[PDB]
Structure formats: C-alpha cells, structure tokens
Design a protein around this ligand. Structure first.
Ligand code: CLA
Ligand SMILES: CCCCCCCCCO[C@@H]1O[C@H](CO)[C@@H](O)[C@H](O)[C@H]1O
Ligand SMILES: CCCCCCCCCO[C@@H]1O[C@H](CO)[C@@H](O)[C@H](O)[C@H]1O
Ligand SMILES: CCCCCCCCCO[C@@H]1O[C@H](CO)[C@@H](O)[C@H](O)[C@H]1O
Ligand SMILES: CCCCCCCCCO[C@@H]1O[C@H](CO)[C@@H](O)[C@H](O)[C@H]1O
Ligand SMILES: [Hg+2]
Lengths: 177, 163
C-alpha cells in the first residue's frame, strides 16, 4: 500500500552535452542520428548529382565556387561548421545506445556512418568552395583513379548511404537518468 | 546493459575509452600547436620541416602520414571507441571540455596536413590565403591559440571517469 522510503541514490551528472557540459543541454544521440541521416542523403545526392550532370552540388545550387572561404555565403559556412561540430559530437552526445537485451547495423553503427558522412560532406564542400570542383572531381584528382573507374565505386557509396539513411538500426536509446 | 560505445559503435568492449581518447587528444593539441609555432619560426609547414613531399595528390603522399591522418580523423569522431563516461565530481574545464578541445585539435591538424599535402602550404599560409588576413595580423591570434592548446594539453580537467 504505502511504499517504503528510498535512500536517494547520488544522481550522476554526465558530461555529454553541448561542448561537454553536464547541464542537460545539447543533442541526444537520437538527434545526432537524424542529422547524420540528413548528411548521408545530402552527400549521396551530391555525388549522384555530380555523376549525372558533371557539376558539383554548390554549383547546382547557384553558389560561387573557386573562391577563398571568407567570400562564400556565411550560411554555407555555418552549415559546414554545424556539420563538423556535429560529427565530433560537440553539439551534444546525450544518452546511450544499447543492445536490445535478449544481423545488420545497430543504431550506433548507423551513428558512425552518419558521422563519416558528415566529415566527407564537409570536406567536399570546403573543397568545392576553394577549387570549384565537386566531390567526384576531387575524388578523381586525389585518388589518381580515372573517372570511368571511380564512377561505379562511388555509385556503390550512394546506394550504401541511401540504404543506411533509411535503416533504423537495432538496439534502443537510453536516457542518462 | 551492453553499451554500444566501442570500435565503430560495437558493444563487445573493444576500442578506446574516453581516457585513451583524451590522451591522444592532448598529443594532438601539442602536435598542432608545435606545427603552427614551427611554421612561424621556420616559415615552412610541418611536413616540409620534416622534409616530407608536398604539393602532390593524396595517393602519392607517405602511407604513414595518411595512416596518421585517418587515425586522427576517426579518433576525432569517436569511431575508434568512446567507452565509459565523464561525470562531474560529487578554468572550470572538465575532462569532457578537454576531450572536445582535443577533438578540435585533431580536426584542425588533419585539415592542415591534407591541405599542406595538396598545396605545399603550411597551416599559417592556408589561414592567410583563406581568411584574407595578412600573416602579420594572423600570428598574434595564432600564438594566443598556441598558448591555449599547450595550457589545455597539460590541464588535467575536473571530473572523473566511470566504466
Ligand atoms: C596503410 C594503410 C592505409 C590506410 C589505413 C589508409 C586510410 C584511408 N585512406 Mg589512404 N592510401 C594508402 C594507405 C592507407 N590509407 C596508400 C599506400 C595509398 C597509395 C595508393 C593511399 C592512397 C589513398 C587515396 C588517394 C585516398 C585514400 C583514402 C583513405 C580512406 C579510406 C579509403 C581506403 O581505405 O582505401 C585505401 C586503399 C587501399 C587500402 C588499397 C587496398 C589494399 C589491398 C589489400 C591491397 C592492394 C594492393 C595492390 C592493388 C595489389 C597488387 C600489387 C601491385 C601489382 C599494384 C582512409 C583515410 C581516401 C580518402 O581520403 O577518404 C575516402 C582517398 O581518397 N588513400
Ligand atoms: C543539417 C540538417 C538538419 C538541421 C537541424 C537538425 C535538428 C535536429 C533535431 O532532430 C530531431 O531528433 C529526433 C530524434 O528521433 C527526431 O525524431 C526528430 O524528427 C528530429 O527533428
Ligand atoms: C526511429 C527510427 C527512424 C529512422 C528513419 C527516419 C527517416 C530519416 C530520413 O531523413 C530524411 O532526409 C531528407 C534530407 O534530404 C529529408 O528530405 C527528410 O525530411 C528526412 O526525413
Ligand atoms: C602519435 C600516436 C598517437 C598517440 C598515442 C596513442 C596511445 C593510446 C593509449 O592511451 C593511454 O591512455 C591513458 C589515459 O589515462 C594514458 O595514461 C596512457 O599514457 C595512454 O597510454
Ligand atoms: C616527428 C613525428 C613522426 C616521425 C618521423 C618523421 C618523418 C620525417 C622523415 O623523413 C624521411 O626522409 C625523407 C625526407 O622527408 C623522405 O624521403 C621520407 O619520406 C621520410 O620518411
Ligand atoms: Hg630531402
């Protein structure tokens, strides 16, 4: 009927919030996962779009390329900063992913695919800003691999990222408390 | 029960702990700062100071350097393991703030290295070209940044580590 009084356990303030703080402020791992999916689809669409048109994504979006970074649209620079900070989990990494207590990707695997996507996307965008060359052209130049031999390998990436972006992942999200 | 915070998110208990990461991060802070300072003193990027070939495509660069860049990048995003937690003790910088300064240093270092490989220009010169700000107006701010990383690399940070 009446519950016994519980000796209140010393609650732990976890340092996994915005820039590491413990004040419960910042993205959860779920938020990060979503943002990561958006980056997966964006990166994939960038590569596919360039593979089809021959033009980088920023060029297709009517933005100036082949310019120093300080001349680029500040909104683009902000998106790049956001993407990078998110990739390293600086915008908050609150909570945990755990195995479903009881054979594809787990939610954490998904999270890391998302972070890799964020890195590659940010790097490719900065690259296009400075050089005027899209992610595919950059890949061709830096790998030494001819375009015809790099196209299928890139198409495999587009498919990989697209599938990953829709895959929920196994396991469950758990709040710090 | 089984946390997914190990190597590439695995729960097997394989991978770096947050402490390992923090250490690697300190090493990164010191490396980055020392490379900036070194460019200031020598006028040459760190890779040129180490006499490594620059102004070249990535695939022609030394495999150990590329190894190091990948390692640094994967470490920055926690893919090499992020096991355990940092919690408040039951300036003001916690070990988590420290971890993120380290990750920032890792991103910046990796960036500058790839940039130097491709362009043959050190981090300071990259900064100059990409901000429009003259080198002489740049160096004080960078020196301040250099002092910060050295301070952070040595600062233990408050809080503790839980398994
Ligand atoms: C030593 C380990 C090593 C590691 C861990 C990395 C890690 C990374 N590299 Mg670098 N790289 C290396 C050595 C390494 N590289 C060497 C030796 C070269 C010269 C060819 C390059 C040239 C290179 C380029 C141009 C790029 C990367 C990229 C990458 C990323 C992943 C892509 C990848 O793994 O393909 C690496 C390729 C292999 C590991 C080759 C497969 C190995 C099989 C086992 C052996 C094949 C040898 C040969 C073909 C067999 C016949 C021998 C002879 C007849 C030729 C990551 C940053 C890319 C990136 O920036 O992110 C995506 C990128 O664009 N790498
Ligand atoms: C760079 C592209 C996106 C810019 C801003 C990202 C805002 C992050 C919020 O994420 C939220 O996290 C939840 C997790 O489940 C989702 O359910 C929810 O729908 C989603 O809104
Ligand atoms: C609880 C687990 C749910 C996992 C799967 C959720 C779907 C995530 C897909 O992201 C989508 O990315 C696009 C970016 O271009 C947007 O158009 C679109 O609005 C956005 O929804
Ligand atoms: C240029 C190479 C990259 C950096 C070296 C990687 C070593 C990773 C192991 O971390 C360990 O974590 C502890 C945390 O407390 C430290 O005390 C300890 O000394 C350290 O060994
Ligand atoms: C300081 C941290 C890392 C340890 C090793 C530093 C690398 C510098 C050594 O130069 C070596 O000699 C020649 C000149 O660069 C090159 O032909 C060769 O590629 C390179 O191997
Ligand atoms: Hg030499």
């Amino acid at each position: 009927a009446k519950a016994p009084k519980k000796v209140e356990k010393p609650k732990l303030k976890v340092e996994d919030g915005l820039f590491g703080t413990s004040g419960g402020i910042g993205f959860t791992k779920e938020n990060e996962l979503f943002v990561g999916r958006v980056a997966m689809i964006g990166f994939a669409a960038s590569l596919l779009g360039e593979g089809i048109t021959g033009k980088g994504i920023l060029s297709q979006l009517n933005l100036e390329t082949g310019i120093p970074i300080y001349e680029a649209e500040p909104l683009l620079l902000f998106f790049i900063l956001f993407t990078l900070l998110g990739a390293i989990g600086a915008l908050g990494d609150r909570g945990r992913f755990v195995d479903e207590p009881t054979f594809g990707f787990t939610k954490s695997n998904e999270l890391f695919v998302g972070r890799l996507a964020q890195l590659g996307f940010a790097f490719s965008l900065i690259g296009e800003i400075i050089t005027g060359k899209g992610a595919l052209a950059q890949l061709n130049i830096e790998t030494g691999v001819p375009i015809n031999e790099i196209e299928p390998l890139v198409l495999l990436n587009v498919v990989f990222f697209f599938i990953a972006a829709i895959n929920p992942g196994t396991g469950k999200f758990i709040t710090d408390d």
